[PDB]
Amino acid sequence: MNIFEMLRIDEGLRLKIYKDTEGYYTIGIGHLLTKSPSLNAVKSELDKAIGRNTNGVITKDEAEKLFNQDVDAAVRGILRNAKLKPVYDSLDAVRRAALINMVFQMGETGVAGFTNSLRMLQQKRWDEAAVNLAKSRWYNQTPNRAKRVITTFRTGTWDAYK
């Protein structure tokens, strides 16, 4: 297992425009297009992202390219963030994937906002961090996914994805 497979499991793959759990327009492997409701704004964003006149549909290869750019960007975001980087550097390879998963889903700002959890992860207080992380809107809204990520932080194994 690795980051790509993990996220592929949590986000699915859809080749036509769809709304995410929060109702926002997305496509592919969790690629958020826009928070706007206009199907126009949406079509524009897609065309611009893909570089061609779409019509709300993309190929698998196009979805994969966007996915690769997204993972890259999430990693890059962690490495640039002063609150995130230190945590990421302190973690083992499996746990690093859990953190990237969170960033991809909720953005750098969102995650950097879990101060308490972040400090507990840095101190390697796995159980404590898992409890803290559970006390969040994120877990309440997407509990199955949040439970998979949390377990991964708790155990440092891929067991939740197996």
Side-chain angles (χ1 to χ4, degrees):
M1 256 290 284
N2 47 66
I3 191 58
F4 291 93
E5 283 192 37
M6 185 196 207
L7 284 166
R8 173 38 207 289
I9 289 160
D10 285 335
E11 299 290 343
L13 167 70
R14 304 192 81 181
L15 306 173
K16 216 220 121 84
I17 299 203
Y18 68 91
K19 292 205 218 183
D20 71 3
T21 63
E22 204 85 44
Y24 304 138
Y25 282 117
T26 310
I27 196 150
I29 311 161
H31 182 83
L32 169 79
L33 287 161
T34 189
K35 307 184 346 235
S36 155
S38 139
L39 251 254
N40 312 97
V42 183
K43 289 270 9 286
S44 151
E45 292 300 322
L46 178 66
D47 286 356
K48 135 158 114 61
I50 297 316
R52 88 197 165 47
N53 221 103
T54 56
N55 225 24
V57 337
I58 62 167
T59 76
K60 120 164 297 232
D61 282 27
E62 289 180 330
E64 280 150 19
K65 168 208 118 121
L66 291 173
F67 185 34
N68 277 323
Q69 301 169 161
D70 296 343
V71 170
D72 192 18
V75 175
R76 290 176 298 73
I78 285 168
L79 306 167
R80 277 211 236 83
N81 183 295
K83 127 154 5 153
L84 303 169
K85 173 154 148 67
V87 184
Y88 186 92
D89 284 355
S90 71
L91 298 165
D92 58 274
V94 181
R95 294 185 170 91
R96 281 177 181 168
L99 184 62
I100 296 171
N101 190 309
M102 292 177 75
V103 175
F104 184 98
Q105 188 190 355
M106 80 188 36
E108 151 194 21
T109 313
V111 189
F114 286 61
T115 270
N116 296 328
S117 307
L118 290 187
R119 148 188 78 286
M120 285 168 204
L121 290 171
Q122 208 176 353
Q123 282 153 22
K124 309 203 172 298
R125 314 245 177 270
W126 315 126
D127 295 44
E128 302 181 56
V131 167
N132 190 259
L133 283 166
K135 295 146 124 213
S136 62
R137 170 177 199 274
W138 168 59
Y139 185 73
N140 289 99
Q141 293 311 126
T142 62
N144 281 347
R145 194 206 180 131
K147 299 181 351 86
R148 284 195 299 269
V149 173
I150 291 161
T151 298
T152 306
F153 278 131
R154 282 190 45 39
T155 66
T157 65
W158 293 110
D159 295 345
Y161 286 81
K162 291 159 355 179

